[PDB]
Subunit: 154 residues, 6 copies
């Protein structure tokens, strides 16, 4: 009965995120994508739907929203692992502090997975920014999400 939680704001979910979800789903019996309720572009409901749309082929993955401490979200679902994607060593050091804190306060482990090379430079933020000024980000987002993004801007 293994399992992991994949956390984020996912505003919107990118192909980099989806790659991490797919890898987590391949290695744990159960995966929960945890969507933070927190000034964003998409509502929590929209963010959840976009993730659900993009993960239809992952039968052991579900999507849920929450707030407060991530470790409480994880433990209240009977799990004690987080899976997070990483691009750089700079990312590793900041996330490292959080992972060690989360282990300390709740015994929750964090597993980091290296970004697929093709998505090393995509982030929800840069994708939104580039799209806003007319740049083509269609290759960096699920087809679903891309059309939804065009809608919000226009």
């Amino acid at each position: 009965m293994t399992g992991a939680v994949c956390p984020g704001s996912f505003d919107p979910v990118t192909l980099g995120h989806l790659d991490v979800f797919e890898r987590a789903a391949a290695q744990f019996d159960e995966v929960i994508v945890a969507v933070l309720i927190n000034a964003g572009m998409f509502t929590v409901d929209e963010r959840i739907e976009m993730i659900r749309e993009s993960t239809a082929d992952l039968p052991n993955l579900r999507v849920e929203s929450g707030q407060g401490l991530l470790v409480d979200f994880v433990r209240e679902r009977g799990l004690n692992a987080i899976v997070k994607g990483l691009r750089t060593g700079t990312d590793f050091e900041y996330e490292l502090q959080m992972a060690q804190m989360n282990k300390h306060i709740a015994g929750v482990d964090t597993f980091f997975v290296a970004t697929a090379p093709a998505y090393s430079f995509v982030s929800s933020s840069l994708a939104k920014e580039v799209a806003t000024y007319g740049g083509d980000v269609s290759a960096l987002l699920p087809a679903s999400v891309h059309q939804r993004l065009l809608g919000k801007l226009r």
Copy 2:
């Protein structure tokens, strides 16, 4: 039927390694510690025995030796995940190259886990070096290993 491989030379295994093994064993149904056959201090047999001694309380962990490509070792056992411990962002960038190569050539995923804070500075190499000049490393190694190390030096 989940599983992961924890690779290394483990010459000797440290408490930092053992911490990673325990976390992997807690999150995967099956863990295999892969001991590289490669100028070291302990023979492969000694390294295996020291790991087996220190992991007696982990029923779902086994220890095996091998050489060649790690991804072949992993795939030949029906698995496609590696679990590796990390201390720094410098570690992340070098290991990152390897993880991406391993994914490319064999579809094998790599999950990195942050070192426990108390073992952030221990490595097989520094422990051997410090012990050689008379420094006390007893708190950094399994009790087992520590006595074996004293034997090799004296």
Copy 3:
């Protein structure tokens, strides 16, 4: 007479900070902990509360004293006849931004900066993360001086 200044906002002081204070006090004839007064971003504790929490935690360091200030840190340091800063570091990224600051402070005022690695046990605590965790009912009592933890619970109610 040797000496160094240990700067910060200390909102609140953590065991990571205390570890740096103790190491500085062991190596310099005098240490001054310099608590930043910031007009804009008012934090959780007042400057007086922050000073009191540091003094409680450093009661056994007779050569360390606690003072508040604002503006340019190197002015604070030189006004007290000193020309060294001691700061704790956790990561390589920490070293890069702090490096820029140290070189700037050396350039503009001839004040040197000595960095010390945090004890492994406190490598992940920070004032901001401790407050955030505590706010949602996480237990950070092992990461803070005893008196700080008590005061922090009070401010949260």
Copy 4:
């Protein structure tokens, strides 16, 4: 003439670190355009005219360099001038990682290349932001800024 590069920034104000980069780009490309980014939603310390004047006064010895402002996507500014190279100065490994993301995005969306150059050691620690902050509280940054900038900065602060 033929080869060319764009040196982007907010240059609010330009520093000696920036000037070093401009000089090195101008020595290696037939033309260099210093691209002054203006955020239409947030005024910097200096207006666009002031920023451009300060750069021109300290680049008078570089005949193949010119200065232009813009906004929006950098790659559009570069391509609309028939170029496809950006030259940017870098101080640290942390500098490299975030600029890396933007360089790969810019290549992806517009085929524009980015060349990074290590800043001169003497300027490894000046940035526009740190210079402004230090000057605000009275520190001496005169050796870090061109003559075209230092007293104009002090004037803004006073």
Copy 5:
């Protein structure tokens, strides 16, 4: 007339190298790929084989030429009337050691260094890792020019 030198051992040249060569050739009037001759560590391919593999892979770059040399790189660069080096970079750690070298080369000879980020697809390939993987029967054909891959298989038998 602008120009730059792209240095390396290229044992063998990879698609990561080729990507850098193409970008340099697109931005400079001339590019010289400088192949290191090393008396001590003899690699897998001879200098002549390495040059031939680069020339095959750069056949469509008319302003790029391939030459060998040894000793101080900045001497090679200045002897050819140039004063720029172009090098590919993958990581922040790469930037730190290469940074030291670039500043040294600028100091001793006035030669500048321009760094370019590898294309994402080739960020993990290196000559050494490709050889190691190939030695044990791993498939690196997507990471090397077609002709290099053929030659590499031959040397392994």
Copy 6:
């Protein structure tokens, strides 16, 4: 007198970056000991006497600094002199991470503290090893080494 620190290295040869660190330590501690590490299993370019002579000649203006060689564990060298501080110069974040490991180990095994100081910008890029390599192939490193070193280095190479 009372406070004190040890500045360790192989100093094969000492560079201006090292000297900067020595001067800064000597300004902040009552006594400073430069600890010259000798590997009994591998000769450097310079013998122990040569290394010590080159350091002494370039630290004559520092009355509270002395120079001693040793081998084995640094923390034993430090503690046997009644001190418990190491001062080391650092150039980069990568420098910090590996030195971090050794500093935490040294504190663990012997209670010895390590203080790091940022090298002066002008020397951010000299190391003993790179100076030797550049000089070997004829590059000019005269501005990176004290007078006590440069021509002795050229002599070794010739």
